């Protein structure tokens, strides 16, 4: 089964390919409109497998150096292995001399196609956490933020190094390790500062001691008291004015601080803001409340003064922190926009988190901020730091590029395609921050000539190697080797077509579309998206020419156009009903999510709970809203519960509470158990809504159903389908 294949290979290798059978011909690979691409989760949580306590064995050929993997043929008589990539014959290290067919090392076993090594790379390093805190907010929000930060301090490893940079109109860099007296350097939040500047201005260069960054359990009590001591920015806010907030200067100081003290090691720069930057480089809006912040209309009509300048400021800091190996988080809670559009590149490129909300004094934020510090079954943070991702391919496949939370390392080589996609031109990327959630999209190109024979073994291989700093300080190397069969398209079209993963392809094409819209500022992303959908219909559909009623799709393709119908009208591509900060927020989380959550984002799921049936997903239509059943809707960003008319009065009357009807008792608790399960797992925490037929709060449900570029923009899926069928049969 291909369903069973897709599911097993993601659970084991954390990979979802657009096509699980690849065409031998580079010419026919183009003719299949969706490229050979994969969603890749490098740290896919794998509790069944143990960590391997020795060094990976590497192919001795200089131009290759691939890791020993289960696809390598082994001469158990001669104690040699042949690399599946370059066919070099390699000897095993003398530790393996007792290798045999029935007693082979872990890396050769098919259960370890995905494997993690624990290696020794010199001195261990403690985790670093730099809190950059906005103090231009109300005392309630500031006090609530103080609790969450004190709480996070209690969870950090005892050896972890912490530091505090507070800022309002001024930027104050605090000094730790000093007890009985505390110093602080104060900067104007009006001028920018470089690394070499800050080093000389702060005078920088077996228990270790740095002035600005100190161990947690060693200076634990002084800081948690200080966070409670922290009060508002003392400057008064005049009439109709916004506080002078200089977040861009504080971030530049925070980035430059770690840059010339602890470069090239794990560090989180966590910026908390309760409003937009109003002063200094990186400013998003003036201090006059008379002038509104932003809108997609203002920037479109070129009426946004501070957008282009401020964006360049944060882009410069993002590439400095990514080059240094540092993570930048942004926790923004305010009643209005905070500048996420101009700041998105800092978490987007370093793998840092982006969190939205109305205030810090909400359940939503407090629960989200502690999910950041979720520990695994061994008591260690689920965070990884300074990940280097190297990909190696068979000589018939080249790498077009990657799309997701990463930065290119500019590693050229034979596997790198000349035609680039996303973050391309390299076979290595840096990912400063990652978790078992982090999912990149890698795009490949079949290079084998059209009339060339099928490659040697009949299957193409791809190896993913991820070296990262574990949250325990250990150096880990995660290796995943996959293989898919080559196919002669001239004789095996149905084999290729049957291996199509429509869910993976839809998301893989979505990342292309969103990257092309958000980056490079494409004007007609939909016209590309519509054209590719029509070709896929013309290629893999069944029809008689000029007969739209004849058109049909097999089960392997039938869901793809519906995905495209919701994608092209979703908030990731149509932004003019959200604020620029909101649009950047949705795209930030989509670009780093697995397949399951990505499908939920593009096409929200609607489960119906009715008698005489288990919970069944139903069409996102007003027709699904029936009186007999209770429906759950997941939007990823939000969860909603809705009860029909007849069920609404049953519950208020209390038949649930009757000892007669245990029948109704479990029907109104089943979706709440299911909703609460998604609540306490997803990151960030989604906002939750429970409503009924009266539905004062049920407006978002109806706004997601029946809500009101060659293909039609009509809201009715059928009208979109009948137009797609018409064009596919031309
Ligand atoms: Zn090799």
DSSP 276-300: ---SSTT--S-SBTTS----HHHHH
d(C-alpha 639, C-alpha 622), whole Å = 18
Nearest to 469 by CA among 153, 707, 125: 125
Q: Which two tokens stand for residue 657?
A: 């509470």
- Cβ atoms 512, 403 nearer than 8 A: yes
Nearest to 84 by CA among 461, 482, 487, 466: 461
d(C-alpha 166, C-alpha 153), whole Å = 16
Distance 55 CA to ligand 1 centre (A): 17
Distance 84 CA to ligand 1 centre (A): 7
Any binding-site annotation on 346? no
Residue indicated by tokens 């657009």: 18
Resolution rounded to one decimal, in angstroms: 2.6
Cis amide linkage into residue 684, ω under 30° from 0: yes
Q: Where are the alpha helices (DSSP H) in 280-408?
A: 296-300, 307-324, 340-343, 345-350, 363-371
Distance 394 CA to ligand 1 centre (A): 10
- Cβ atoms 32, 17 nearer than 8 A: no
Residue indicated by tokens 């001469």: 75
Any binding-site annotation on 415? no
d(C-alpha 109, C-alpha 74), whole Å = 12
Q: Which two tokens stand for residue 327?
A: 């993570």
Distance 62 CA to ligand 1 centre (A): 8
Any binding-site annotation on 64? yes
- Cβ atoms 79, 501 nearer than 8 A: no
Write down all domains in the chain, each with its CATH number in brackets. Answer: 1-52+114-124+383-487 (2.60.40.1670), 53-113 (2.30.30.380), 125-382 (3.40.50.410), 488-602+715-730 (1.20.120.730), 603-714 (3.40.20.10)
Residues 6+ apart with CB under 8 A from 5: 20
Q: Which two tokens stand for residue 403?
A: 């799309």
Any binding-site annotation on 432? no
Residue indicated by tokens 């709480």: 151
Pairing of strands 161-167, 128-134: parallel
Distance 77 CA to ligand 1 centre (A): 20
Distance 89 CA to ligand 1 centre (A): 8
Distance 87 CA to ligand 1 centre (A): 6
Nearest to 272 by CA among 182, 373, 164, 376: 164
For residue 130, give the DSSP letter.
Answer: E
Residues 6+ apart with CB under 8 A from 377: 47
Distance 58 CA to ligand 1 centre (A): 8
Q: Which two tokens stand for residue 549?
A: 């009623």
For residue 682, give the DSSP letter.
Answer: S
d(C-alpha 96, C-alpha 142), whole Å = 59
Report how far Cα 524 is from the mean position of its chain's Cα atoms.
25
Residues 6+ apart with CB under 8 A from 390: 411, 427, 428, 464, 465, 466
Distance 82 CA to ligand 1 centre (A): 8
Nearest to 346 by CA among 271, 409, 414: 271
Distance 81 CA to ligand 1 centre (A): 10
- Cβ atoms 13, 49 nearer than 8 A: no
Task: Kindly tell me the sign of the dihedral angle through the C-alpha atoms of 244, 247, 250, 256.
Answer: negative
Q: Which two tokens stand for residue 259?
A: 């840059």
Nearest to 537 by CA among 727, 710, 716: 727
Distance 68 CA to ligand 1 centre (A): 9
Structural method = X-ray
Distance 59 CA to ligand 1 centre (A): 5
Q: Rounded to whole angstroms, what are the CA distances from 49 to 7, 34, 374, 548?
A: 18, 33, 20, 51
Nearest 10 degrees: Cα torsion 151, 157, 159, 165: -40
Q: Which helix (H) or strand (E) holds 608?
A: strand 605-610
Distance 65 CA to ligand 1 centre (A): 5
* Direct distance between the N- and C-terminal alpha carbons of the chain, in angstroms, rounded to an integer: 34
How big is the CA angle at 261 (ends 313 and 219), to the nearest 5 degrees?
Answer: 110
d(C-alpha 494, C-alpha 478), whole Å = 35
């Amino acid at each position: 089964t291909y369903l069973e294949f897709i599911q097993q290979n993601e659970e084991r290798d954390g990979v979802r390919f657009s096509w699980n059978v690849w065409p031998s011909s580079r010419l026919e690979a183009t003719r299949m409109v969706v490229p050979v691409a994969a969603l890749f989760t490098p740290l896919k949580e794998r509790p069944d497998l143990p960590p391997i306590q020795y060094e990976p064995v590497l192919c001795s050929r200089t131009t290759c150096r691939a890791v020993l993997n289960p696809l390598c043929q082994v001469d158990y008589r001669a104690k040699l292995w042949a690399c599946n990539f370059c066919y070099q014959r390699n000897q095993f290290p003398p530790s393996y001399a007792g290798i045999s067919e029935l007693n082979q090392p872990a890396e050769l076993l098919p259960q370890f196609s995905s494997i993690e090594y624990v290696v020794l790379r010199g001195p261990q390093m403690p985790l670093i956490f730099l809190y950059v805190v906005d103090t231009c907010m109300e005392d309630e929000d500031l006090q609530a933020l103080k609790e969450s930060m004190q709480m996070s301090l209690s969870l950090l490893p005892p050896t972890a190094l912490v530091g505090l940079i507070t800022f309002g109109r001024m930027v104050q860099v605090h000094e730790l390790g000093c007890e009985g007296i505390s110093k602080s350097y104060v900067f104007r939040g009006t001028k920018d500062l470089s690394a070499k500047q800050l080093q000389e201005m702060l005078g920088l260069s077996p228990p270790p001691s740095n002035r600005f960054l100190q161990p947690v359990q060693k200076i634990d009590m002084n800081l948690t008291d200080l966070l409670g001591e922290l009060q508002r920015d003392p400057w008064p806010v005049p009439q109709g004015k916004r506080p002078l907030r200089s977040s861009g200067v504080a971030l530049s100081i925070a980035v430059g601080l770690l840059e010339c003290t602890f470069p090239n090691t794990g560090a989180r720069i966590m910026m908390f803001i309760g409003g937009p930057a109003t002063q200094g480089p990186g400013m998003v809006v003036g201090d006059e409340l008379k002038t509104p912040i932003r809108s997609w209309h203002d920037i479109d009509k070129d009426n946004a003064k501070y957008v282009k300048k401020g964006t360049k400021h944060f882009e410069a800091l993002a590439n400095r922190a990514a080059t240094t190996g540092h993570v930048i988080d942004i926790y923004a809670c305010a009643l209005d926009q905070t500048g996420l559009l101009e700041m998105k590149c800092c978490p987007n490129l370093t793998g840092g988190y982006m969190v939205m909300g109305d205030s810090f004094n909400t359940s939503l934020f407090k629960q989200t901020f502690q999910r950041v510090f979720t520990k695994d079954m061994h008591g260690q943070f689920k965070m990884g730091f300074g990940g280097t991702l190297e990909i190696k391919t068979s000589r018939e496949i080249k790498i077009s590029g990657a799309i997701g939370p990463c930065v290119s390392l500019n590693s050229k080589g034979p596997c790198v395609s000349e035609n680039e996609i996303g973050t391309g031109g390299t076979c290595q990327w840096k990912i400063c921050g990652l978790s078992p959630t982090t999912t990149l999209a890698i795009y490949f190109e079949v290079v084998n000539q059209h009339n060339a024979p099928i490659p040697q073994g009949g299957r193409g291989a791809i190896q993913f190697v991820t070296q990262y700093q574990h949250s325990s300080g250990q150096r880990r190397i995660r290796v995943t080797t996959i293989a898919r069969n080559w196919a002669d398209a001239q004789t095996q079209i149905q084999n290729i077509a049957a291996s199509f993963d429509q869910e993976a392809a839809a998301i893989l094409m979505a990342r292309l579309a969103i990257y092309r819209a958000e980056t490079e500022e494409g004007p007609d992303v939909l016209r590309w998206l519509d054209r590719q959908l029509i070709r896929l219909c013309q290629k893999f559909g069944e029809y008689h020419k000029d007969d739209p009623s004849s058109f049909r799709f097999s089960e392997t393709f039938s869901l793809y156009p519906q995905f495209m119908f919701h994608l092209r009208r979703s908030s990731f591509l149509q932004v003019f009903n959200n604020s620029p900060d909101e649009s950047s927020y949705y795209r930030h989380h989509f670009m780093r999510q697995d397949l399951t959550q990505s499908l939920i984002m593009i096409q929200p799921i609607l489960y119906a709970y009715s008698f005489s049936g288990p919970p069944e997903p139903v069409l996102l239509d007003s027709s699904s809203i029936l009186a007999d059943r209770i429906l759950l809707m997941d939007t990823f960003f939000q969860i909603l519960i809705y009860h029909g008319e007849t069920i609404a009065q049953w519950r208020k009357s209390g038949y649930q509470d009757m000892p007669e009807y245990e029948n109704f008792r479990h029907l109104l608790q089943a979706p709440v158990d299911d909703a609460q399960e998604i609540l306490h797992s997803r990151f960030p925490m989604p906002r939750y809504i429970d409503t009924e037929h009266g539905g004062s709060q049920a407006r978002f449900l109806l706004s997601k159903v029946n809500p009101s570029p060659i293909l039609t923009d009509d809201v009715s899926l059928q009208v979109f389908m009948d137009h797609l069928k018409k064009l596919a049969v031309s």
